[model samples]
Target: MEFRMKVFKDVFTNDEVCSDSYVQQDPFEVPEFREIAFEVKSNKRIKHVIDIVDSFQLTSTAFSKKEYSAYIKNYMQKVAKYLEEKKPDRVEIFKTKAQPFIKHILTNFDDFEFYMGESLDMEAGIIYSYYKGEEITPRFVYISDGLFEEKYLEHHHHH
Candidate 1:
């Protein structure tokens, strides 16, 4: 099943961001477009991120499901580390670089979209498109439920 998630904060609206003067008028204002792409993260986080990219480049492995889980875990770790290191970046520079230059346009443009899905047996935890928000679930009950699914280490008992 498929799920769609969208978030409109006090800033952004349903109106097209492309049409918004602030967002459209100055493309350079959005750090994600230009600045973030050039950012260099910590070496360890960079290694994890590189591994994720490498996993995608390699041929599909046997036990693909397990591989995918490992990939996801590593990818999450990379992302967590990346976010943690963002302080040095403009993410925390809301005043000097952000406020005077881009804050006006972005002030009302805090929007996000997330699309999530999974296969019948929960094989592929497909995060199709994560746009601008963070939501566990949006459309399908299955995807939503999966967001809340508890994790427990299973110890098998041999019969």
Candidate 2:
């Protein structure tokens, strides 16, 4: 059975992020982008951010589903880490980086799409706000006219 998971937020609405204004618009104006992408964890995050400084690259338009997943899961690893630590790049910063950036993405675009099925199963919502879900039935209960489904640990009573 295919279950369609509910999505709470959609981040990539505009593949058109390559427009001249988008390219020209300074993301650093927001304190967190500069802090998270460049300050707190400047290693891979900067590379991902700069690589697409993008007329094409920085956009989800350019990235496959694999690329956009938590956006470089690559991006979120550092981004999420910083937020959870409660210690950002410097004492100068206050607002969290990823949330603002996420708000920026949702606000900028309007394409409107959300992942369902296994994609949602990934807990890939790490970059954005909290999503609501996680309901299930006991797997063994649905054997349906068949024998018991043994999913328990270790070998049981054998012949």
Candidate 3:
């Protein structure tokens, strides 16, 4: 049988909520990105997150720290490039409520748009401001999420 899979996009989150079927039988024959657009339920309103997750029947929680970090770096750098061209006017604060070492950031993209920012990767986290490959996302330096957000909000609240 030919390879087939269902893909999903988040409305609020804008993530491609991964499907459980990806782990399935793989002679692995797939086309390209734009083909997925044809599958869009164009008549729909804002999409549902959990329903999409349930539809895909997704599941995963594993350790691929090494390769995961690599993908994050590649992903963030690509985003950095995109943010440059997009030049979006809005930005928001990002931080971890759990880990103290995780650094907070004022990201160029909105909360939903900055999906990678919430990633709990050890060597990586969220992003903004990276020209080449220099520097990292999650600073080992600690900050309270509320304090950081308070500072960031004041800084951002200009009329």
Q: In candidate 2, what are the lDDT values of residues 61-150, reduced to their tens digit?
A: 233444454453454554345444553443233234445654655554332223222123232222111111331210000000111112
lDDT of 3 by residue, 1-159 (tens): 234334333322333333323332201121221111111110112453323223423332232445444654564444334434443321112111121111112221121111132223333223211111332221111111111111112323221
lDDT to native, each model: 0.25, 0.28, 0.26
TM-score of each: 0.20, 0.24, 0.26
Count: clashes, candidate 1: 5
Report the lDDT tens digits of candidate 1 across residue range 1-159. Answer: 333323111111111111111111112224443321111111112444322113222112232444444644554344334444643343343223323322332333223121222111223222221112344322110111112212223344211
Between candidates 1 and 2, which one is better according to lDDT? 2
**Root-mean-square deviation of candidate 3:** 20.4
lDDT of 2 at 50: 27
Using lDDT as the measure, the top candidate is: 2
List the candidate 2 regions with Cα displacement exceeding 4 Å. Answer: 1-34, 37-61, 64-67, 72-74, 78-95, 109-159
State, as a TM-score between 0 and 1, how close model 1 is to the true structure.
0.20
> Could you tell me which 10 consecutive residues in candidate 1 have the lowest summed lDDT?
12-21
Error (Å) of candidate 1 at residue 51 is: 31
